[PDB]
Amino acid sequence: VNSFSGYLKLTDNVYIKNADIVEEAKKVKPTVVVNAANVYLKHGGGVAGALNKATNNAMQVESDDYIATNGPLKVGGSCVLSGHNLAKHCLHVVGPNVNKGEDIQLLKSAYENFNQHEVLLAPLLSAGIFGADPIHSLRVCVDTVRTNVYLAVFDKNLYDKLVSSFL
Numbered sequence: 001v002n003s004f005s006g007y008l009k010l011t012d013n014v015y016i017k018n019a020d021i022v023e024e025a026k027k028v029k030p031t032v033v034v035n036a037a038n039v040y041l042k043h044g045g046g047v048a049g050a051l052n053k054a055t056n057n058a059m060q061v062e063s064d065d066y067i068a069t070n071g072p073l074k075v076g077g078s079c080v081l082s083g084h085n086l087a088k089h090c091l092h093v094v095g096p097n098v099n100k101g102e103d104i105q106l107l108k109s110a111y112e113n114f115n116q117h118e119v120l121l122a123p124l125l126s127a128g129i130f131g132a133d134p135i136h137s138l139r140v141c142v143d144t145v146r147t148n149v150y151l152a153v154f155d156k157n158l159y160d161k162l163v164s165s166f167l
């Protein structure tokens with residue numbers, strides 16, 4: 001039993017809700033919140049911009065030190081950093097950005113990172129400003145993630161389409 005509330009159950013392990021991941025994380029304080037990261041961990045907009053703003057830029061400061069030491073992530077890759085005031089940990093995951101021409105097949109590799117964590121709060125990878133079809137992203141999530149994932153969808157209209165169209 002966990003403290004996530006108001007989710008619709010899609011499969012044994014995947015759940016979904018129309019919610020603001022920033023507000024969800026502050027309420028639940030999950031063990032792991034997933035960020036929709038880029039390889040440079042530059043959290044300028046989208047989910048990453050919102051999560052970083054909620055940390056008062058501490059996420060960006062930590063991320064800049066990470067990159068200075070380790071260099072950029074891979075598309076499809078991830079790193080574990082602090083969750084600051086939002087969660088114990090933040091799993092920064094790089095889904096392909098279609099608006100950069102990045103291969104959408106890497107979306108499965110991106111979701112595989114979730115399997116290293118028993119329970120996660122997450123957005124749909126490569127959705128929003130990353131340009132992928134959220135219906136495809138949800139399908140890949142369900143077919144790739146085996147651990148317990150609580151998916152937060154900010155937009156109410158989009159959530160209804162994902163649910164009504166879920167096979």
Ligand SMILES: Cc1ccc(C[C@H](CO)Nc2ncnc3[nH]ccc23)cc1C
Pocket residue numbers: 019020021022036046047050123124125126127128129134152153154155158
């Ligand atoms: C119009 C529109 C907006 C957003 C999305 C999803 C992306 C992630 O898939 N953004 C987010 N998802 C969850 N919480 C969030 N908080 C801040 C940003 C954000 C899709 C579409 C079509």
Ligand SMILES: [Cl-]
Pocket residue numbers: 045046047127128129130
């Ligand atoms: Cl977004």
